[PDB]
Amino acid sequence: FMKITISGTGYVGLSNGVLIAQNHEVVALDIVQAKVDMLNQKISPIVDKEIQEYLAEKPLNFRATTDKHDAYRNADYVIIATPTDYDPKTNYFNTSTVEAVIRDVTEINPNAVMIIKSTIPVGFTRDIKERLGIDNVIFSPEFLREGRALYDNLHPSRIVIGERSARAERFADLLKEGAIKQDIPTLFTDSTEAEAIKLFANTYLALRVAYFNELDSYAESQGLNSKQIIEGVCLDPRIGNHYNNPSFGYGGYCLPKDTKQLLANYESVPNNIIAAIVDANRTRKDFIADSILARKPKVVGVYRLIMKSGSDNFRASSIQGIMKRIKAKGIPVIIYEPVMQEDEFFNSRVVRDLNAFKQEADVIISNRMAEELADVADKVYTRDLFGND
Amino acid sequence: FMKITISGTGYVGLSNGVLIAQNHEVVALDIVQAKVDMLNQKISPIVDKEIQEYLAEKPLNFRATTDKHDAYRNADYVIIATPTDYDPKTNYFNTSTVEAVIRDVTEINPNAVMIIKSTIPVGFTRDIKERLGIDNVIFSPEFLREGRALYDNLHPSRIVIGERSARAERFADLLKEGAIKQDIPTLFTDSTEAEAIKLFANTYLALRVAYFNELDSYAESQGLNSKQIIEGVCLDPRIGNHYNNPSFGYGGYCLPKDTKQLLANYESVPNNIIAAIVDANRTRKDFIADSILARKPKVVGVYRLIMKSGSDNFRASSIQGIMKRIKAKGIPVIIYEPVMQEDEFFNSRVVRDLNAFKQEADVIISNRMAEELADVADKVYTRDLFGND
Ligand SMILES: O=C(O)[C@H]1O[C@H](OP(=O)(O)OP(=O)(O)OC[C@H]2O[C@@H](n3ccc(=O)[nH]c3=O)[C@H](O)[C@@H]2O)[C@H](O)[C@@H](O)[C@@H]1O
Ligand SMILES: O=C(O)[C@H]1O[C@H](OP(=O)(O)OP(=O)(O)OC[C@H]2O[C@@H](n3ccc(=O)[nH]c3=O)[C@H](O)[C@@H]2O)[C@H](O)[C@@H](O)[C@@H]1O
Numbered sequence A, B: 001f002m003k004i005t006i007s008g009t010g011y012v013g014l015s016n017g018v019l020i021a022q023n024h025e026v027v028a029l030d031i032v033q034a035k036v037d038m039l040n041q042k043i044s045p046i047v048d049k050e051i052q053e054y055l056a057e058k059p060l061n062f063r064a065t066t067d068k069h070d071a072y073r074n075a076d077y078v079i080i081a082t083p084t085d086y087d088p089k090t091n092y093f094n095t096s097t098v099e100a101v102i103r104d105v106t107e108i109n110p111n112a113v114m115i116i117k118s119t120i121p122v123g124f125t126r127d128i129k130e131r132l133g134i135d136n137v138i139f140s141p142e143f144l145r146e147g148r149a150l151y152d153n154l155h156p157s158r159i160v161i162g163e164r165s166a167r168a169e170r171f172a173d174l175l176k177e178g179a180i181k182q183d184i185p186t187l188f189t190d191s192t193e194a195e196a197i198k199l200f201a202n203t204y205l206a207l208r209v210a211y212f213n214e215l216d217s218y219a220e221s222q223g224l225n226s227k228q229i230i231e232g233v234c235l236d237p238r239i240g241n242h243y244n245n246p247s248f249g250y251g252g253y254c255l256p257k258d259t260k261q262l263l264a265n266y267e268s269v270p271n272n273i274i275a276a277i278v279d280a281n282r283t284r285k286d287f288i289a290d291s292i293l294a295r296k297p298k299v300v301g302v303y304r305l306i307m308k309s310g311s312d313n314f315r316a317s318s319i320q321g322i323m324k325r326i327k328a329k330g331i332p333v334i335i336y337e338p339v340m341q342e343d344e345f346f347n348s349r350v351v352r353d354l355n356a357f358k359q360e361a362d363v364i365i366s367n368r369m370a371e372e373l374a375d376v377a378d379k380v381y382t383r384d385l386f387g388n389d
């Protein structure tokens, strides 16, 4: 009986699409013909174990298309999951793909209930509901991690829908019904609350990582053992032994990332906290780059530009800011990134062969330790302590 | 067979003193004759349920004195628990009571092993061990909360001793032996690590509170419901539903408290994080005071100057910064603080009678909600949401 349309087929879109398609008609809409074509062949266009396997082994009422009229037709719900983020040039939060999908749906099927899953600024929903004069827009935050997308939906921490209504609960049941986890905590709120819940949840996660990275910098510069200190600190149950693995800096979260983005949007965000994670991150990259330059390297080898294993994001990857700082000093950099087709990145040679890379670099820096590097461990610089995230 | 001396009898000192006195000879040394006199009469000089009751109902090998020669004589361990904190005038971290007790013990019983429990700056132990030429000084952080002092020792999150040695484990066993909780996680480290573990654990707790207070400010200024937002944010298990009750600002932790203390000690502490909690706290008090002044009050009534129920600390209490801000505007303030003998505080009248206070104040502000105020709830301003800490 029920038809759900996903507008945008990135990992957030497919995650929800596949979850719901176990019991309902799901139609995935995208603007890239080629991704759509593979989806229709049951081939996942992104790396994510469960998405790839549910799409090829489980019976799903799922299909993809680049046709919005066929996609939105008779849709009961349209989940919006198109790209949103702060623009790196203008520094304004860019919500144009979402604006666009809303005008389209309003135009093509003003009876569908639109659930926004893409992160948006606090107050976006209330404002657009008013600027266009519609009422069928509801925000519902996404809390999943790239690479565990479907997984986090099959076992969600919780579900938050930005509307207190029957249609809002109807949607929550769709999500609970597809999930493996039972008794998912479910909270119904207004849309501005729900947007703020997303903003603050991410702010905190970024804050936690920023904090462990200062702690780690502090230990390193003071000659202390990071791991014993973190163990000691995390034995306090109010702090916890989780999400505490030092790195070269954090990236992502749809949070202003430098002080220019913070300034262009202060007042949409909690000013002191953001200022804090932004300054800590900038500071962490200076410390890390300084720490690498002190080993007086001749050629630095950057091992992987993606941040998390199996990722497809370079944008938000802190190793970039390290390269930037080392190159500022004139040190040559070579890169080992299989996912990268380009032969040079900001003019640094991208070496295709792992062994040639290992031989040419006197210092190899890597955000997380890796098996492939075990044989050159003696020249590997990483602040990874636990091997997770 | 074993004798332990506690130098300093505040709640940290008595906590440990009573814990250990269940199975060993404990002698408490203080410089205030009157406190000592009451201890010898089995009367606790501080409010703390378990300390008062263990001291008066359990068989303890415990006594107090103002005589250092008798106190330190034949002591195997001397636990140092004298006052340390940033001085509010010079802004330097003041460790003089601890310096003093160490010269004394070195002088009187250079064979006792000194365990510092008072919070000290990172590197203090290593440095003093060297400046004096002694070796019997070990730092071991205290993680207890005023009012639950003995309680937190009977059920500690963990035990950290700043030394890897037999004498260090001997001490850890004293602590484990007195405890009710079993299998206490125990970590042995060097002293600088152990000092940093204390610094960072407190930094994080202050950070968490600072964060929930921005979140709360953000909601209030945006018209949102704080409680739903916090519920939503805390349903993420990486964040947790604990230690998240909004207040007028945090106080304490032996952390630099304003930017002058931060500046006088930057480089002993994690610069960006501290700068962040300090700015957030200053900002929270501006927001709260502004929020109270907007109710255009004629007389503001400050209900309790202590921060936590049953506390004896005014120093670190954020309601002070609120008074300061409201008085800056010329609004009269009256105070209801039974623990305070003074008839005026910074020239604001301290009203002794709760009913007269209730009648004279058009706005009553209070850090946590209280039963006594239920009948005037309509004019009570508090940001307390959960009724805890
Ligand atoms: O809105 C989002 O974008 C998502 O952001 C993160 O998901 P994700 O960035 O894919 O994975 P994380 O593990 O949270 O990594 C976040 C950042 O912190 C860093 N990090 C994370 C964990 C850690 O222990 N150490 C560490 O340095 C990562 O390398 C990365 O820079 C959150 O975990 C999700 O809940 C949220 O929905
Ligand atoms: O130079 C930049 O591109 C950016 O640097 C900062 O943004 P931020 O995120 O704080 O930069 P970092 O994390 O410190 O470094 C990442 C950036 O370095 C650049 N990059 C990367 C690799 C490289 O070899 N050289 C290089 O300049 C990339 O554009 C990447 O965005 C500034 O705040 C931005 O104004 C500026 O756009």
Ligand SMILES: O=C(O)[C@H]1O[C@H](OP(=O)(O)OP(=O)(O)OC[C@H]2O[C@@H](n3ccc(=O)[nH]c3=O)[C@H](O)[C@@H]2O)[C@H](O)[C@@H](O)[C@@H]1O
Binding pocket: B119, B142, B143, B144, B145, B146, B202, B205, B209, B242, B243, B244, B245, B246, B247, B248, B249, B250, B251, B252, B253, B254, B307, B308, B388, B389
């Ligand atoms: O070294 C110390 O001094 C101690 O500091 C705190 O103990 P305490 O300050 O007595 O009690 P807390 O409950 O942690 O209160 C800390 C501050 O945060 C505020 N707070 C705390 C918790 C909360 O949910 N909301 C909140 O505003 C309190 O009013 C106060 O300003 C820590 O909890 C102890 O582990 C630590 O040993």
Ligand SMILES: O=C(O)[C@H]1O[C@H](OP(=O)(O)OP(=O)(O)OC[C@H]2O[C@@H](n3ccc(=O)[nH]c3=O)[C@H](O)[C@@H]2O)[C@H](O)[C@@H](O)[C@@H]1O
Binding pocket: B088, B257, B258, B259, B260, B282, B285, B318, B320, B321, B322, B323, B324, B327, B345, B346, B348
């Ligand atoms: O005016 C001050 O005494 C202090 O204010 C700040 O220190 P901070 O902790 O950031 O001050 P707040 O928390 O904003 O306010 C607390 C202070 O206000 C003062 N106070 C209290 C009550 C009152 O009615 N008037 C008043 O001035 C007390 O001295 C108390 O220390 C400044 O950073 C310090 O330089 C200065 O010593």
